[PDB]
Design a protein around this ligand. Structure first.
Ligand SMILES: CC(=O)N1CCN(c2ccc(CN(CC(C)C)S(=O)(=O)Cc3ccccc3)cc2)CC1
Length: 234
Protein backbone atom coordinates (compact mmCIF):
# COMPACT_ATOMS: atom_id res chain seq x y z
CA UNK A 1 0.00 0.00 0.00
CA UNK A 2 1.04 3.60 -0.77
CA UNK A 3 0.71 6.66 1.51
CA UNK A 4 -2.38 7.68 -0.51
CA UNK A 5 -3.93 4.23 -0.02
CA UNK A 6 -3.05 4.31 3.70
CA UNK A 7 -4.61 7.77 4.01
CA UNK A 8 -7.69 6.54 2.15
CA UNK A 9 -7.99 3.66 4.64
CA UNK A 10 -7.69 6.14 7.54
CA UNK A 11 -10.43 8.39 6.12
CA UNK A 12 -12.63 5.36 5.43
CA UNK A 13 -12.29 3.91 8.94
CA UNK A 14 -13.02 7.32 10.47
CA UNK A 15 -16.14 7.77 8.32
CA UNK A 16 -17.34 4.26 9.24
CA UNK A 17 -16.98 5.11 12.93
CA UNK A 18 -18.70 8.49 12.52
CA UNK A 19 -21.65 6.74 10.87
CA UNK A 20 -21.91 3.94 13.47
CA UNK A 21 -20.76 5.66 16.70
CA UNK A 22 -24.36 5.31 18.03
CA UNK A 23 -24.16 8.40 20.22
CA UNK A 24 -22.55 11.61 18.92
CA UNK A 25 -19.69 12.94 21.03
CA UNK A 26 -21.23 16.43 20.88
CA UNK A 27 -24.45 15.13 22.46
CA UNK A 28 -22.64 13.10 25.14
CA UNK A 29 -20.62 16.18 26.17
CA UNK A 30 -23.58 18.58 26.16
CA UNK A 31 -25.57 16.21 28.38
CA UNK A 32 -22.83 15.98 31.06
CA UNK A 33 -24.70 18.60 33.12
CA UNK A 34 -27.77 16.33 33.08
CA UNK A 35 -27.28 14.11 36.14
CA UNK A 36 -29.63 11.74 38.00
CA UNK A 37 -30.99 13.30 41.19
CA UNK A 38 -30.79 11.48 44.55
CA UNK A 39 -34.41 10.30 44.20
CA UNK A 40 -33.79 9.04 40.66
CA UNK A 41 -30.72 7.05 41.84
CA UNK A 42 -32.79 5.59 44.72
CA UNK A 43 -35.42 4.67 42.12
CA UNK A 44 -32.81 2.70 40.16
CA UNK A 45 -31.41 1.09 43.33
CA UNK A 46 -34.89 -0.17 44.26
CA UNK A 47 -35.42 -1.96 40.95
CA UNK A 48 -35.00 -5.72 40.91
CA UNK A 49 -31.73 -7.14 39.66
CA UNK A 50 -34.02 -8.60 36.97
CA UNK A 51 -35.28 -5.22 35.79
CA UNK A 52 -31.76 -3.77 35.79
CA UNK A 53 -30.61 -6.82 33.85
CA UNK A 54 -33.25 -6.37 31.12
CA UNK A 55 -32.47 -2.62 30.82
CA UNK A 56 -28.74 -3.29 30.68
CA UNK A 57 -29.24 -6.23 28.28
CA UNK A 58 -31.24 -3.93 25.97
CA UNK A 59 -28.56 -1.23 25.99
CA UNK A 60 -25.75 -3.75 25.47
CA UNK A 61 -27.54 -5.48 22.59
CA UNK A 62 -28.12 -2.11 20.92
CA UNK A 63 -24.43 -1.16 21.41
CA UNK A 64 -23.28 -4.47 19.87
CA UNK A 65 -25.58 -3.88 16.87
CA UNK A 66 -23.72 -0.64 16.13
CA UNK A 67 -20.32 -2.38 16.52
CA UNK A 68 -21.38 -5.04 14.01
CA UNK A 69 -22.48 -2.24 11.61
CA UNK A 70 -19.03 -0.63 12.11
CA UNK A 71 -17.33 -3.93 11.26
CA UNK A 72 -19.47 -4.44 8.14
CA UNK A 73 -18.25 -1.03 6.91
CA UNK A 74 -14.53 -1.76 7.40
CA UNK A 75 -12.66 -2.17 4.15
CA UNK A 76 -12.07 -5.87 3.62
CA UNK A 77 -14.23 -7.18 6.50
CA UNK A 78 -17.10 -8.15 4.20
CA UNK A 79 -14.60 -9.89 1.89
CA UNK A 80 -13.63 -12.33 4.66
CA UNK A 81 -15.53 -15.62 4.71
CA UNK A 82 -18.68 -15.79 6.86
CA UNK A 83 -17.00 -17.99 9.52
CA UNK A 84 -14.21 -15.44 10.07
CA UNK A 85 -16.57 -12.45 10.30
CA UNK A 86 -18.36 -14.36 13.07
CA UNK A 87 -15.11 -15.37 14.81
CA UNK A 88 -13.86 -11.76 14.88
CA UNK A 89 -17.12 -10.25 16.13
CA UNK A 90 -17.79 -13.00 18.66
CA UNK A 91 -14.31 -12.35 20.13
CA UNK A 92 -14.21 -8.57 19.82
CA UNK A 93 -17.60 -6.86 19.66
CA UNK A 94 -18.06 -6.61 23.48
CA UNK A 95 -14.41 -5.43 23.79
CA UNK A 96 -15.24 -2.60 21.34
CA UNK A 97 -18.36 -1.74 23.40
CA UNK A 98 -16.15 -1.39 26.50
CA UNK A 99 -13.74 0.91 24.63
CA UNK A 100 -16.63 2.96 23.12
CA UNK A 101 -18.00 3.43 26.66
CA UNK A 102 -15.19 5.87 27.53
CA UNK A 103 -16.87 8.55 25.36
CA UNK A 104 -20.00 8.27 27.51
CA UNK A 105 -17.98 8.53 30.72
CA UNK A 106 -17.32 11.76 32.62
CA UNK A 107 -14.04 11.61 34.57
CA UNK A 108 -14.88 14.87 36.37
CA UNK A 109 -17.55 13.24 38.52
CA UNK A 110 -17.15 9.52 37.64
CA UNK A 111 -20.53 9.16 35.93
CA UNK A 112 -21.71 7.30 32.82
CA UNK A 113 -24.50 8.20 30.34
CA UNK A 114 -27.34 5.73 31.02
CA UNK A 115 -30.97 6.03 29.92
CA UNK A 116 -30.71 9.74 29.20
CA UNK A 117 -28.75 11.12 32.17
CA UNK A 118 -25.39 10.67 33.89
CA UNK A 119 -25.14 8.41 36.95
CA UNK A 120 -22.39 6.99 39.13
CA UNK A 121 -21.58 3.37 39.86
CA UNK A 122 -24.13 3.32 42.73
CA UNK A 123 -26.96 3.57 40.14
CA UNK A 124 -26.30 -0.13 39.37
CA UNK A 125 -26.42 -1.34 42.97
CA UNK A 126 -29.31 -3.80 42.43
CA UNK A 127 -27.15 -5.89 40.08
CA UNK A 128 -24.97 -6.95 43.05
CA UNK A 129 -21.92 -6.80 40.75
CA UNK A 130 -20.05 -3.92 42.40
CA UNK A 131 -16.56 -5.30 41.66
CA UNK A 132 -17.30 -5.68 37.95
CA UNK A 133 -19.06 -2.26 37.74
CA UNK A 134 -16.15 -0.59 39.53
CA UNK A 135 -13.65 -2.25 37.13
CA UNK A 136 -15.62 -0.98 34.12
CA UNK A 137 -15.65 2.55 35.59
CA UNK A 138 -11.89 2.36 36.36
CA UNK A 139 -11.16 1.19 32.82
CA UNK A 140 -13.22 4.04 31.34
CA UNK A 141 -11.50 6.50 33.68
CA UNK A 142 -8.08 5.26 32.45
CA UNK A 143 -9.15 5.72 28.81
CA UNK A 144 -10.67 9.17 29.44
CA UNK A 145 -7.29 10.34 30.73
CA UNK A 146 -5.98 9.93 27.15
CA UNK A 147 -8.56 12.31 25.61
CA UNK A 148 -9.10 9.91 22.73
CA UNK A 149 -10.15 11.71 19.59
CA UNK A 150 -13.05 10.30 17.54
CA UNK A 151 -10.63 9.16 14.87
CA UNK A 152 -8.26 7.53 17.40
CA UNK A 153 -11.24 5.58 18.72
CA UNK A 154 -12.22 4.63 15.16
CA UNK A 155 -8.76 3.28 14.33
CA UNK A 156 -8.11 1.71 17.76
CA UNK A 157 -11.48 -0.13 17.79
CA UNK A 158 -10.98 -1.34 14.21
CA UNK A 159 -7.79 -2.99 15.51
CA UNK A 160 -9.58 -4.46 18.51
CA UNK A 161 -11.80 -6.27 15.98
CA UNK A 162 -9.32 -7.09 13.23
CA UNK A 163 -7.00 -9.41 15.15
CA UNK A 164 -5.42 -12.36 13.32
CA UNK A 165 -4.72 -14.25 16.55
CA UNK A 166 -8.40 -15.03 17.29
CA UNK A 167 -8.76 -18.83 17.52
CA UNK A 168 -10.87 -20.46 14.80
CA UNK A 169 -9.99 -18.24 11.82
CA UNK A 170 -10.09 -20.13 8.51
CA UNK A 171 -8.34 -17.43 6.46
CA UNK A 172 -5.76 -16.22 9.01
CA UNK A 173 -3.50 -14.78 6.31
CA UNK A 174 -6.31 -12.55 4.97
CA UNK A 175 -6.97 -11.26 8.50
CA UNK A 176 -3.19 -10.67 9.05
CA UNK A 177 -3.13 -8.54 5.88
CA UNK A 178 -6.13 -6.48 7.04
CA UNK A 179 -4.71 -6.07 10.54
CA UNK A 180 -1.34 -4.93 9.16
CA UNK A 181 -2.94 -2.36 6.84
CA UNK A 182 -4.98 -1.05 9.77
CA UNK A 183 -1.87 -0.81 11.95
CA UNK A 184 -0.19 1.24 9.18
CA UNK A 185 -3.29 3.46 9.02
CA UNK A 186 -3.33 3.96 12.81
CA UNK A 187 0.40 4.67 13.14
CA UNK A 188 0.45 6.93 10.07
CA UNK A 189 -2.49 8.96 11.40
CA UNK A 190 -0.97 9.31 14.89
CA UNK A 191 2.14 10.74 13.19
CA UNK A 192 0.04 13.19 11.11
CA UNK A 193 -1.74 14.40 14.25
CA UNK A 194 1.37 14.49 16.51
CA UNK A 195 -0.29 11.85 18.67
CA UNK A 196 2.55 9.24 18.75
CA UNK A 197 2.48 9.61 22.55
CA UNK A 198 -0.75 7.64 23.00
CA UNK A 199 0.48 4.19 21.79
CA UNK A 200 2.55 3.51 24.93
CA UNK A 201 -0.40 4.72 27.03
CA UNK A 202 -3.01 2.36 25.56
CA UNK A 203 -4.16 -0.47 27.84
CA UNK A 204 -2.31 -3.75 27.25
CA UNK A 205 -4.33 -6.08 24.99
CA UNK A 206 -4.65 -8.45 27.98
CA UNK A 207 -6.40 -5.83 30.14
CA UNK A 208 -9.32 -5.37 27.79
CA UNK A 209 -9.63 -9.15 27.26
CA UNK A 210 -9.56 -9.74 31.03
CA UNK A 211 -12.29 -7.16 31.67
CA UNK A 212 -14.40 -8.47 28.82
CA UNK A 213 -14.09 -12.03 30.16
CA UNK A 214 -15.31 -10.90 33.61
CA UNK A 215 -18.09 -8.89 31.95
CA UNK A 216 -19.31 -11.78 29.72
CA UNK A 217 -19.35 -14.23 32.66
CA UNK A 218 -21.74 -11.96 34.52
CA UNK A 219 -23.85 -11.45 31.37
CA UNK A 220 -24.17 -15.20 30.75
CA UNK A 221 -25.58 -15.78 34.25
CA UNK A 222 -28.32 -13.17 33.71
CA UNK A 223 -29.18 -14.08 30.07
CA UNK A 224 -29.47 -17.79 30.95
CA UNK A 225 -32.44 -17.05 33.24
CA UNK A 226 -33.87 -13.92 31.57
CA UNK A 227 -33.58 -13.63 27.75
CA UNK A 228 -34.95 -10.57 25.90
CA UNK A 229 -35.99 -9.61 22.33
CA UNK A 230 -34.47 -6.36 21.03
CA UNK A 231 -35.10 -4.01 18.06
CA UNK A 232 -32.48 -4.01 15.28
CA UNK A 233 -31.14 -0.99 13.35
CA UNK A 234 -30.76 -1.74 9.62
C1 LIG B 1 -22.11 3.90 22.42
C2 LIG B 1 -22.44 4.61 23.71
O1 LIG B 1 -21.84 5.63 23.96
N1 LIG B 1 -23.38 4.13 24.58
C3 LIG B 1 -23.67 4.83 25.84
C4 LIG B 1 -23.36 3.84 26.96
N2 LIG B 1 -24.19 2.63 26.74
C5 LIG B 1 -24.32 1.82 27.88
C6 LIG B 1 -24.34 2.44 29.14
C7 LIG B 1 -24.47 1.69 30.29
C8 LIG B 1 -24.60 0.31 30.22
C9 LIG B 1 -24.74 -0.46 31.52
N3 LIG B 1 -23.48 -1.15 31.89
C10 LIG B 1 -22.19 -0.45 31.84
C11 LIG B 1 -21.57 -0.04 33.18
C12 LIG B 1 -21.02 1.38 33.06
C13 LIG B 1 -22.52 -0.11 34.37
S1 LIG B 1 -23.54 -2.81 31.68
O2 LIG B 1 -24.74 -3.03 30.96
O3 LIG B 1 -22.28 -3.19 31.13
C14 LIG B 1 -23.70 -3.42 33.39
C15 LIG B 1 -23.93 -4.91 33.57
C16 LIG B 1 -25.20 -5.46 33.44
C17 LIG B 1 -25.41 -6.82 33.62
C18 LIG B 1 -24.35 -7.65 33.94
C19 LIG B 1 -23.08 -7.11 34.08
C20 LIG B 1 -22.86 -5.75 33.91
C21 LIG B 1 -24.58 -0.33 28.98
C22 LIG B 1 -24.45 0.42 27.81
C23 LIG B 1 -23.86 1.92 25.48
C24 LIG B 1 -24.13 2.88 24.32
Amino acid sequence: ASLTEIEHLVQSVCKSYRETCQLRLEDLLRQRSNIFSREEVTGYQRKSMWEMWERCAHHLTEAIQYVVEFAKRLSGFMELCQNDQIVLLKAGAMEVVLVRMCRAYNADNRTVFFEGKYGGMELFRALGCSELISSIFDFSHSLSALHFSEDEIALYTALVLINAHRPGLQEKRKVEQLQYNLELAFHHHLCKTHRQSILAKLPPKGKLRSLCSQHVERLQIFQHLHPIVVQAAF
